[PDB]
Amino acid sequence: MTEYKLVVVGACGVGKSALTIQLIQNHFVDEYDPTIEDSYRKQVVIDGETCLLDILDTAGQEEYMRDQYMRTGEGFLCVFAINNTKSFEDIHHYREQIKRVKDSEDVPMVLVGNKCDLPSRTVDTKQAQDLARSYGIPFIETSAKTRQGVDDAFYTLVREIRKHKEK
Numbered sequence: 001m002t003e004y005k006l007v008v009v010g011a012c013g014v015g016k017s018a019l020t021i022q023l024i025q026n027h028f029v030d031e032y033d034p035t036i037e038d039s040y041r042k043q044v045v046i047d048g049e050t051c052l053l054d055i056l057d058t059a060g061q062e063e064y065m066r067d068q069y070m071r072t073g074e075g076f077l078c079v080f081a082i083n084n085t086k087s088f089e090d091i092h093h094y095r096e097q098i099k100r101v102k103d104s105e106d107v108p109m110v111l112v113g114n115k116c117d118l119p120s121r122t123v124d125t126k127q128a129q130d131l132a133r134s135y136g137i138p139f140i141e142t143s144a145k146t147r148q149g150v151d152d153a154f155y156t157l158v159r160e161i162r163k164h165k166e167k
């Protein structure tokens, strides 16, 4: 089957691990070791193609040396949390990092606004839409707690990779 190398990036605490674990195990984690970085595998049918997703759940090596495992990534989920203004403001840094590791301004990428189930919103959907439009990428809101938008964010990334290269 076809392998898709996905990388999940973003500020600590936005829900990178919870989004990955919800996608793979259909379960929401109340806590997950903030320092653990690992790649997880998931076989799934997307638009009739049997795909092997190899997802790197980053812990933030550069912020806390270069992460050698990110360089082979074909697509990136850039995650902020809708109740964490700082994580949204940090999106510029992660996008610059992705451009640097791939030496390109045309990288398959999806801006993800996680924790959409929470009522303490500080990042408006229009702020995230403006940011995603300047980068030329899709913006999707998710909840790793309720699974709302989770499959869509990962499948949209797979579709963005296909849009960029033959798979």
Ligand SMILES: Nc1nc2c(ncn2[C@@H]2O[C@H](COP(=O)(O)OP(=O)(O)O)[C@@H](O)[C@H]2O)c(=O)[nH]1
Pocket (backbone or CB within 6 Å): 010, 011, 012, 013, 014, 015, 016, 017, 018, 019, 029, 030, 031, 032, 033, 034, 114, 115, 116, 117, 118, 142, 143, 144, 145, 146
């Ligand atoms: N309510 C809610 N909490 C979430 C969601 N995603 C993550 N969290 C919580 O936010 C905290 C940090 O999540 P985690 O996945 O470890 O973040 P990471 O550092 O980006 O990997 C944990 O307590 C999670 O349960 C979500 O969509 N909704």
Ligand SMILES: *CCC(=O)Nc1cc(C)nc(C)c1Br
Pocket (backbone or CB within 6 Å): 011, 012, 013, 034, 035, 059, 060, 061, 064
């Ligand atoms: C949420 C990410 C995080 O806490 N990462 C982290 C923290 C510390 C203290 N050290 C390292 C090496 C890392 Br990746």
Ligand SMILES: [Mg+2]
Pocket (backbone or CB within 6 Å): 016, 017, 018, 032, 033, 034, 035, 036, 057, 058, 059
């Ligand atoms: Mg994590």
